[PDB]
Amino acid sequence: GVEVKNITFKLGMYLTVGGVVNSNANRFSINVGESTDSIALHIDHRFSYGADQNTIVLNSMVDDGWQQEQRSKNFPFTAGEHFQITITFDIDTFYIQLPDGHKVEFPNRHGDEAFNFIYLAGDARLTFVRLE
Amino acid sequence: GVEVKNITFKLGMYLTVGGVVNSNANRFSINVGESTDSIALHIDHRFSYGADQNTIVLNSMVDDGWQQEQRSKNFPFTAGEHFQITITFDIDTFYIQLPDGHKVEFPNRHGDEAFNFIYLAGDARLTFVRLE
Ligand SMILES: OC[C@H]1O[C@@H](O[C@H]2[C@H](O)[C@@H](O)[C@H](O)O[C@@H]2CO)[C@H](O)[C@@H](O)[C@H]1O
Numbered sequence: 001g002v003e004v005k006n007i008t009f010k011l012g013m014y015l016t017v018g019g020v021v022n023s024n025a026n027r028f029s030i031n032v033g034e035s036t037d038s039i040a041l042h043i044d045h046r047f048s049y050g051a052d053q054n055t056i057v058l059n060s061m062v063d064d065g066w067q068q069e070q071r072s073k074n075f076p077f078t079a080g081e082h083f084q085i086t087i088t089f090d091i092d093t094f095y096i097q098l099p100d101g102h103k104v105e106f107p108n109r110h111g112d113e114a115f116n117f118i119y120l121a122g123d124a125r126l127t128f129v130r131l132e
Numbered sequence: 133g134v135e136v137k138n139i140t141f142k143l144g145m146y147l148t149v150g151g152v153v154n155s156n157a158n159r160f161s162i163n164v165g166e167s168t169d170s171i172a173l174h175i176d177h178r179f180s181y182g183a184d185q186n187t188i189v190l191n192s193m194v195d196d197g198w199q200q201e202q203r204s205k206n207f208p209f210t211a212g213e214h215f216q217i218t219i220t221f222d223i224d225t226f227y228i229q230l231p232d233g234h235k236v237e238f239p240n241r242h243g244d245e246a247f248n249f250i251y252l253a254g255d256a257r258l259t260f261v262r263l264e
């Protein structure tokens with residue numbers, strides 16, 4: 001999937017990612033981070049994957065290893081359709097704004113003040129990114 | 133500058149790139165391409181660089197070498213301010229839509245039907261990209 005690299009996504013800014021979920025999707029993820037074998041914020045939108053149905057699984061990855069999962073059952077997404085999510089953060093917490101207006105919080109586990117990449121994975125295509 | 137990679141920018145689609153020119157700019161470029169040491173379309177917006185003032189210099193790069201320059205004196209850009217450009221193409225030609233409504237044409241010198249990256253260089257920051 002699309003990777004947007006060398007971004008300067010700093011404390012207090014807003015990153016919006018828009019796209020279209022594939023018609024026949026198991027899951028897709030948004031992945032934000034600041035170093036090559038790590039992902040500070042992984043947001044996995046699981047229509048159906050593993051033991052999860054219509055569940056968001058959130059995690060982080062440190063040197064290619066997944067950390068502790070968190071889940072949300074707020075799942076305002078439909079296969080084949082557009083979505084948009086916006087992410088902001090402070091030193092302690094990522095704030096993920098879902099398009100139904102629900103907010104998920106996830107810990108800023110590496111204590112980052114800036115990020116330099118975002119990429120999509122899975123059963124969706126990125127159509128736009130905005131950073132300001 | 134920001135690089136957007138693993139895009140699928142196909143014949144007939146539209147790629148829009150928006151950003152803000154630095155307050156004190158010499159030049160910035162938009163660079164679209166499909167292989168690692170090449171740039172199919174380089175659009176250099178020169179406020180002042182070399183012998184050029186307020187000139188767009190267009191070129192392509194093949195295996196790290198620049199090809200023949202083309203110029204436009206249509207220069208609807210201001211240092212410190214937002215800009216947006218949209219690019220489309222067919223097998224023969226790139227069509228670059230400037231925000232004053234002027235269109236620049238530049239040859240599709242490698243005969244590409246799709247591109248997989250766009251990156252910004254120079255004295256500007258990318259704020260958004262849309263691909264559909
Ligand atoms: O933690 C994010 C990570 O999850 C992996 O899937 C896990 C799954 O969540 C868990 O229930 C099961 O026991 O193990 C799976 C494999 O580790 C995904 O494979 C990975 O891509 C991330 O999404």
Ligand SMILES: OC[C@H]1O[C@@H](O[C@H]2[C@H](O)[C@@H](O)[C@H](O)O[C@@H]2CO)[C@H](O)[C@@H](O)[C@H]1O
Nearest residue numbers: 174176182183189190191198199200201
């Ligand atoms: O052709 C695009 C390429 O131009 C380089 O600058 C040229 C300049 O246009 C030319 O007038 C002068 O004689 O040579 C310069 C150096 O090759 C830029 O340096 C390069 O970044 C591209 O923008």
